[PDB]
Nucleic acid binder design. Structure first.
Ligand SMILES: [K+]
Ligand SMILES: [K+]
Ligand SMILES: [K+]
Ligand SMILES: [Mg+2]
Ligand SMILES: [Mg+2]
Ligand SMILES: [Mg+2]
Ligand SMILES: [Mg+2]
Ligand SMILES: [Mg+2]
Ligand SMILES: [Mg+2]
Ligand SMILES: [Mg+2]
Ligand SMILES: [Mg+2]
Ligand SMILES: [Mg+2]
Ligand SMILES: [Mg+2]
Ligand SMILES: [Mg+2]
Ligand SMILES: [Mg+2]
Ligand SMILES: [Mg+2]
Ligand SMILES: [Mg+2]
Ligand SMILES: [Mg+2]
Ligand SMILES: [Mg+2]
Ligand SMILES: [Mg+2]
Lengths: 77, 136, 93, 51, 121, 116
RNA sequence: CCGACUUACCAACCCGAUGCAAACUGCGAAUACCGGAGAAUGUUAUCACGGGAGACACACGGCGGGUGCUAACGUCCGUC
RNA sequence: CCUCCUAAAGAGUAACGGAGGAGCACGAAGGUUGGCUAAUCCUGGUCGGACAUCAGGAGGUUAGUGCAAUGGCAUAAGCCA
RNA sequence: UGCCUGGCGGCCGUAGCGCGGUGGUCCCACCUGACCCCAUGCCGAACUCAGAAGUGAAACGCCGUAGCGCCGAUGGUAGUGUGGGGUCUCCCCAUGCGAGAGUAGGGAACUGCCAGGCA
């Protein structure tokens, strides 16, 4: 007859906006994410929704770093 | 007949049944009944085949069932249209790939294992073959 | 047991399936400090002798390139349902 | 919901107000906070009033 | 002060013969004594312990004051000592409860220390 | 487990100073000595240093692990930093409370003319 | 007040073996996608702005799937 | 309106597909400084039991997160002032 | 220049555990006391201060040792882009890419700056 499902939320367009080696202007969003899947490295800020954004003009650099092998995003300015 | 005691979810996507089996060796007993074909074994079929081979051995030796029917199969009732939600779970199946050892047996002669498994095989929808434990 | 073998020219899936479609099968000899030797074996010959439980326990000689390599059977990949051998690992004794 | 809107009115007499919500039942005491009044351009005491 | 002064004079001395420790630092010390249930018994004001969780059984909830305790150490523990769980530490039931924690790394070593102070056994 | 607990206390501030790219006056304190290293932003290079194991400071002291000795190291490390022209530093208390000997060192370091 | 033998026995944890998962992952491709560089080739094939639209019932076939009975010349997506 | 899956490892992606949530809460449950670290079990211990609190150990986040799910979280985003 | 110790990094398990040693001159640790500075929702346990009689017991560092964790080929297998084929619910062929698991084996980290002890 009827079903109790049939709901879903709008897709949030998360994920990587600027990949490795891409030249960005300061302020450019590099990744939108839920929590810190990626962490802010050098010249990268972490917004209130865990958005990583460039704090300097330069090139995006993904790196695995530290004792937990966490993924950091940096900007090579 | 076999069925998961619990599941996280009631209903499962149809899926596909590609690939060759994992669990291709006689790992427990001396003798095994192996799938050559691909398909679904229902819990009723698994039970029918189990009762056949068990009766053949006259409750002697030991029987393992290597497959478990953990996939719920839904059906729509008669005279209902398409849509209006997924059908109700009616039975459980194990997906079989070629090479899957279905049953194993120990503590009988090979002759009697071969007969017991022949009687079991006649209950199953898939082509089977008798196999023996290998040293490697 | 004495197995005759040739050095495999070609490796990979295509080469290996062509071997088996001509009643041969690939094998590997490794171990010690020499480089692994990738060999091809006649299927029916080896399948016949590996029926015996002694094949897997005792040292075997692979006559490859006319040279005697003493080996133990380390691993066998069997065909999933047919009574055939896909591959054997041999370790240099 | 339960929470009712209130205005926080500047003590400087500028007329400037902030607005916020308040659970009136659990907290009946008047909300008082030092907030920036942009008319006098100083932090001053703001006090709760009705919206 | 009575028993601190006697711990090192006699009790250190005797335990150093018994087990034949290589150092005085091996010897069991009374590290602390904790009196779970109090301030006339102890002198130290008790700490009201609270529920780690709710329990369907006792009609308790998490952060409910369901206990009270004091941790006597040093001079004040020695002065109350006068007034085995399997690594040196003892517990007495008083018809409150009491615990004596030790740096003794064995079960025979805790009963060596308490009973050297002529603790009733 | 006092070192590991202190390294946990130290980490947040240290990582912040690394993020900022600060030259870092790192203190270490023990029950007997106190130490001070000015470390470059990289974290891998000590620019200047002063301690109460350094015989010159220690031979002029009463006890090496007191607030008087801490102030003596503070003055020393600061004076030597000012020789190289290291004026701007950030103080890494290294998990120790900004209090007593650590504070006494920081106070003397500022009093000499480090800018933190 | 206790205890002690005792089971057609039913048995958690842990240990060793065996499988299974769209809503499992201590692993992890091919492809695809984003960016950079360099040739050749291509009627600028690109982007912007402006004039004029039409169209917003799609169909089958291949591949990946949901649904249905891995029923439908069925149904609903993706992609060619 | 939110979360997951379907969704084919960028984004997006349908069905009267499969599962759940929201229509708030909070002047602290916000800011900052300083500090702290979980579940669960074993051994011992007044009442006290399977489970209260105490002590030690094992364990190592299997906890926690104002409320779903997912992704996070120890430098904690968890806990206290 | 070697050996030891401390601090701060690189690196993030070939680097971590366990288990057997081993070190106190120096350093480190525990330690010794607390009217003090400061501290305990009780407690100098911790934090903090004033110290140096004692011990390396614990911890810590170092060394040894595969019982683990960890790393890990080669070959084969699985999958798969493109083209083609079949008996087309699934496969196969040509070509390109090629895991995961497991196997042999590796494996008891390595390294920069500064300071101090010793030789
Ligand atoms: K961007
Ligand atoms: K299509
Ligand atoms: K706050
Ligand atoms: Mg979503
Ligand atoms: Mg990390
Ligand atoms: Mg191919
Ligand atoms: Mg329309
Ligand atoms: Mg339409
Ligand atoms: Mg369409
Ligand atoms: Mg289709
Ligand atoms: Mg149609
Ligand atoms: Mg169709
Ligand atoms: Mg996607
Ligand atoms: Mg995709
Ligand atoms: Mg579309
Ligand atoms: Mg907070
Ligand atoms: Mg002390
Ligand atoms: Mg020791
Ligand atoms: Mg591999
Ligand atoms: Mg070791």
């Amino acid at each position: 007859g009827s079903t109790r499902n049939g709901r879903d939320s709008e897709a949030k367009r998360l994920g990587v906006k600027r990949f490795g080696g891409e030249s960005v202007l300061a302020g450019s969003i590099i990744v939108r994410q839920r929590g810190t899947k990626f962490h802010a490295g050098a010249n990268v800020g972490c917004g209130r929704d865990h958005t990583l954004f460039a704090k300097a003009d330069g090139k995006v650099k993904f790196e695995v770093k530290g004792p937990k092998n966490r993924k950091f995003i940096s900007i090579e300015a | 007949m076999l069925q998961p005691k619990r599941t996280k979810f009631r209903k499962m996507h149809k899926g596909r049944n590609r690939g060759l089996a994992q669990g291709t060796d006689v790992s427990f007993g001396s003798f095994g009944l192996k799938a050559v074909g691909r398909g679904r074994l229902t819990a009723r079929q698994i039970e029918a085949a189990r009762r056949a081979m068990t009766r053949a051995v006259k409750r002697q030796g030991k029987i393992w069932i290597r497959v478990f029917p953990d996939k719920p199969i839904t059906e729509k009732p008669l005279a209902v249209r398409m849509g209006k939600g997924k059908g109700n779970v009616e039975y459980w199946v194990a997906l079989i790939q070629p090479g899957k050892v279905l049953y194993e047996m120990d503590g009988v002669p090979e002759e009697l294992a071969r007969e017991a498994f022949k009687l079991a095989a006649a209950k199953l929808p898939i082509k089977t073959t008798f196999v023996t434990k290998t040293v490697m | 047991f004495t197995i005759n073998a040739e050095v495999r020219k070609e490796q990979g899936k295509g080469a290996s399936r062509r071997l088996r479609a001509a009643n041969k099968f690939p094998a590997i000899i490794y171990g010690g400090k020499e480089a692994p030797l990738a060999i091809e074996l006649d299927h029916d010959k080896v399948m016949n002798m590996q029926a015996k439980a002694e094949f897997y326990s005792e040292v075997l000689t692979i006559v490859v390139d006319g040279k005697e390599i003493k080996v133990k059977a380390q691993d066998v990949q069997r065909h999933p349902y047919k009574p055939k051998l896909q591959h054997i690992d041999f370790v240099r004794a | 919901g339960i929470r009712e809107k209130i205005k926080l009115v500047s003590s400087a007499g500028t007329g400037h107000f902030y607005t916020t919500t308040k659970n009136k039942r659990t907290k009946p005491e008047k909300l008082e906070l030092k907030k920036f009044d942009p008319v006098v351009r100083q932090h001053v005491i703001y006090k709760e009033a009705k919206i | 002060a009575k028993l601190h002064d006697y711990y090192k004079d006699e009790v250190v001395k005797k335990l150093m013969t018994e087990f034949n420790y290589n150092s005085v630092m091996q010897v069991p010390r009374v590290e602390k004594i904790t009196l779970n249930m109090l301030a006339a018994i102890s002198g130290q004001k008790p700490l009201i312990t609270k529920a780690r969780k709710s329990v369907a059984g006792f009609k308790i909830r998490q952060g409910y004051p369901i206990g009270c305790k004091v941790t006597l150490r040093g001079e004040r523990m020695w002065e109350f000592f006068e007034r085995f769980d399997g690594r040196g530490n003892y517990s007495m039931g008083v018809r409150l409860d009491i615990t004596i924690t030790t740096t003794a790394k064995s079960d025979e070593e805790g009963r060596a220390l308490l009973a050297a102070f002529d603790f009733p056994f | 487990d006092k070192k590991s607990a202190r390294i946990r206390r130290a980490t947040r501030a240290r990582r912040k100073l690394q993020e900022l790219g600060a030259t870092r006056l790192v203190v270490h304190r023990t029950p007997r000595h106190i130490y001070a290293q000015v470390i470059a932003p990289n974290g891998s290079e000590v620019l200047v240093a002063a301690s109460t194991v350094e015989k010159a400071i220690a031979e002029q002291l009463k006890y090496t692990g007191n607030k008087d000795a801490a102030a003596a190291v503070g003055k020393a490390v600061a004076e030597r930093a000012l020789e190289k022209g290291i004026k701007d530093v950030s103080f890494d208390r290294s998990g120790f409370q900004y209090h007593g000997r650590v504070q006494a060192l920081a106070d003397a370091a500022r009093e000499a003319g480090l800018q933190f």
